[PDB]
């Protein structure tokens, strides 16, 4: 065991299961969300014996299995699979139990109550967990990136926040989320790069779905205006070969999907997208703080690591607002990781240890205990 | 054409737009206001050809459009898809045009100087009319309700009025808007059940927002005591089944929606709410006649249509109020028409008449021609 | 702590909490009369953990708070938040306590009984005081401008006096007070421009109230003719920009705000007003000083700051005159502050320090000590 104050730190998330304790940097576990079911007699018995695969391996031998996720875009939607992710979140990776140490978890800038209940019981439950808290990963993630007034875009394998977040304290009521930020995206990717062609189809040619995406994603200074000189011209369309290996042009799926999560009209919706919700949540946030919030706006996680995005910040932010009034958009492509940062860094300290949930609180209270609890 | 005399009604409100003619009850014209700009070549494109949708068929087909509606919390905020909508209002459902036909609208009780006066030239603009008039809300809602006297309160798709009538009368000095009644309602609704579950989110899942408040919605007797009980028992949340079909238990939102109403510390305001108003307005007011006003209290409008909503009045002026002065409360829930209900009893009339604007008088002295005129 | 003599100055008012010590100009406290229970569990919990403000932090922070002021239209309504107004106003702003050190007051000319008494017994209750004092606002803002014999207008966030003084003395007959100056001025400008637009709603487009009408507020030659052409034309109402950037305009609000001061039928009423109020005082005094009344008219506060109100109490005051006898009306815009002037510099003396009623002679007295004391 490590030195640095007796916390476990689990982050829920939607893409990779980042979990470690108190402390660092970049993360000490690192896993996607699957367990997977073999299903045949036949040749899985013919030739194999031994398994079911979890996360990591799970990316290796899979062809073999039935791989769903447990989680979705937000919530747990069936936590069964996400009980024996947890198993494997504490017992080989980190290879430490809850059962006789302290430990955290995150969440999004408030959560609400039956779940949340059940959240603090589940921890209780399979898990047996003497003490725990749970912290905003907004208020964490500003934390991480040192400061005190910052309006974190937040956006994973699934969700986008907007937090406006004063020297410390969230504001209770300017509260939007964007639920496009990795799936919709990456799938509306796989659902068009497919009709351009060669079926990603069954047992070889389907995660390569998630390879491309990011390699290829700079957000474009405009559309139909270069899609126009695109079609007339040859550039931005890069032939590249894949563990097949047949011409593959990918060409607008760069700026083409994180259009979309700018405008999602273009795979076809009549409602909203980011744009607007970032300066909508201000004009209802506080007026006297609406000010500092346009004057410090930062971003957070995944989907936001992208190239051409301050580029698209600076645009149409400004776009919208007033003559008068001033947005300042800060740039730091560390933030990748910056919530599991936040939550391993806040872990370490004196003062969080006392806001610790006690396990004999529990017994005497009942699960509803989190709710006069975790700032 | 009706026998009933020649005099279209219209009835703007924020939600849906309510118009007819003469002597009516129900409405002759229903829409919710939305006209929403297609948007794709491509897809757009290859299925279909024709369209975009004003109202009616655009609560059957939708999830092609860009979904934008243009009268919000009073005022009209943008009128170029309120004169499409008129555009609607007047040439194919009702059918029968305002270039012969003398023409009347509903109004707060009240209204200003220059974003009426435009009002009555706008009319005269686009829609031409040989005569024309508008009547506040308030007094004609009293007098569909069958009373010369009366305090009533509306509350519909974005406000509640407070509005103080004796003989006819509205008194000249207290005046009051709850900008409470629709949509930080329902949508802040949309807010918390969205944190509740399930991102309600993208082309499938979104209008059940305006369907499940209605149904589940009752005021409580109490708040923090019920949500004690609440977090032991599993009693007054139920479960339902949607158009997908995942157990959904919708808990507060039935009381705690309603109460925000009364109490705006339920989103979290800082800052007032209705309780207080229907009261504030009166203790403002003429001692010879806050008698009857308390003893005068009724209601109009779709955000009243509530269960336990008089038990929450009678509770709550009462509980301001002395030990000396009385108040009642009428109870008609009638009264989610009342506001178009009178303008179409009254353009029956021989007396309204003599008071319609010519289009001759107009012309003379400009659009303050209302100034002067109407009653 | 300053060289000049020992003795605490609160000019309490009705709109910004003023005070500081001696011999001073502008003030050296000031600050608006909130304190105000902030509310939530949940979201609250979520986004912090400390306070409740007062008055500056929270005229900065506040949309978290439950704000009301406990001071009104002239003497408190409940002395509760006034009580930790003053804890905030001695303890933390001045620092220094009325532990060890002498306190004076400031108030009306001549004042009641009963909570005058009382306003004996707060100050040496919870604040001990070893020696205090009240004086008389009119008398020393008349001294403060240098002067003997003046009729003086007030007019701060709430209340008006009208006051004669002459080589010292108030006329203990002539006595009118108007309750316009402040609030059912700025808070009708909160009603009509509401009903112009844009609901000065819920958490961010409320204190532009506040703002607006300071700025653009200039009495007027005349109303109505000057309403003729405001409606023809174009002039007077500009088109501005707020944090929020629609067009909106404001017009009459300028004359019609301080229009409703000297005559209140601009809402609604049907009793006096302020011209009127100016003549008659000096109307009902002696006969040979009347002469020197109306020869004498100055004035202070924050809502006798307008442009125009010289020309038009040149106007309006000489309207009601005889063609015998003369008025001279006199000029000062430093007058925002001089009352608060008139305690400090009053403060100083080694004549007022006789004068003090020490708490020895109040133990003996009980609250009967002011009566005979106070000049
Ligand atoms: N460099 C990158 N470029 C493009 N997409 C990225 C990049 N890094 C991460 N993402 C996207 O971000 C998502 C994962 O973000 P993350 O914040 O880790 O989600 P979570 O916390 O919910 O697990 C993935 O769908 C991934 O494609
Ligand atoms: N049965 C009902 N229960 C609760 N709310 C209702 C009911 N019927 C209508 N409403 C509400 O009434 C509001 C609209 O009322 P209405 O007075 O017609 O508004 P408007 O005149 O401004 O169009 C809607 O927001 C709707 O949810
Ligand atoms: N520049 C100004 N122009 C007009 N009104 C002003 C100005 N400055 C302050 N006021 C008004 O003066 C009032 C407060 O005056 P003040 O004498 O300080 O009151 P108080 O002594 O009772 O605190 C408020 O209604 C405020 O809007
Ligand atoms: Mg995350
Ligand atoms: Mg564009
Ligand atoms: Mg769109
Ligand atoms: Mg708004
Ligand atoms: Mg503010
Ligand atoms: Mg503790
Ligand atoms: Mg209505
Ligand atoms: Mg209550
Ligand atoms: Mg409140
Ligand atoms: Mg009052
Ligand atoms: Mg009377
Ligand atoms: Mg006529
Ligand atoms: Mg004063
Ligand atoms: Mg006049
Ligand atoms: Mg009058
Ligand atoms: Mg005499
Ligand atoms: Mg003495």
């Not at 062809?63 to 939607?77: A, C, Q, S, V």
């Not at 439950?125 to 003490?131: H, I, K, L, Q, W």
């Not at 860094?345 to 949930?357: C, P």
Request: net charge negative; glycine share 8%.
């Amino acid at each position: 065991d490590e030195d640095e104050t007796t916390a476990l730190v689990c982050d829920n998330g939607s893409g990779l299961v980042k979990a470690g304790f108190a402390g660092d940097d970049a993360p000490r576990a690192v896993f996607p969300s699957i367990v997977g079911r073999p299903r045949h007699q036949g040749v899985m018995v013919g030739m194999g014996q031994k398994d079911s695969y979890v996360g990591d391996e799970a990316q290796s031998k899979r062809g073999i299995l039935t791989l769903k996720y447990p989680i979705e875009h937000g919530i747990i939607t069936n936590w069964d699979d996400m009980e024996k992710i947890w198993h494997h979140t504490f017992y080989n990776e980190l290879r430490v139990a809850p059962e006789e140490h302290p430990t955290l978890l995150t969440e999004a800038p408030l959560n609400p109550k039956a779940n949340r209940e059940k959240m603090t019981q589940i921890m209780f439950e399979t898990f047996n967990v003497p003490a725990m808290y749970v912290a905003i990963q907004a208020v964490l993630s500003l934390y991480a990136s040192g400061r005190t007034t910052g309006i974190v875009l937040d956006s994973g394998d699934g969700v986008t926040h907007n937090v406006p977040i004063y020297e410390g304290y969230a504001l209770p009521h300017a509260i939007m989320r964007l639920d496009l930020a990795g799936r919709d995206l990456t799938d509306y990717l796989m659902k068009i790069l497919t009709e351009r062609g060669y079926s990603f189809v069954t047992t070889a040619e389907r995660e390569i779905v998630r390879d491309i995406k990011e390699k290829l994603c700079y957000v474009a200074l405009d559309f139909e205006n270069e899609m126009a000189t695109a079609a007339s011209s040859s550039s931005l369309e890069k032939s590249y070969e894949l563990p097949d290996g047949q011409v593959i042009t990918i060409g607008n799926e760069r700026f083409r999907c994180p259009e979309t999560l700018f405008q999602p009209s273009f795979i076809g919706m009549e409602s909203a997208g980011i744009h607007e919700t970032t300066y909508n949540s201000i004009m209802k946030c506080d007026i006297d703080i609406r000010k500092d919030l346009y004057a410090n706006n930062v971003m957070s996680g995944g989907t936001t690591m992208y190239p051409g995005i301050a580029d698209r910040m600076q645009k149409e932010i400004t776009a919208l607002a007033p003559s008068t009034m001033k947005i300042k958009i800060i740039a730091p492509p560390e933030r990748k990781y910056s919530v599991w940062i936040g939550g391993s860094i806040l872990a370490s300290l004196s003062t969080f240890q006392q806001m610790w949930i006690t396990k004999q609180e529990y017994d005497e209270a009942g699960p509803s205990i989190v709710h006069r609890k975790c700032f």
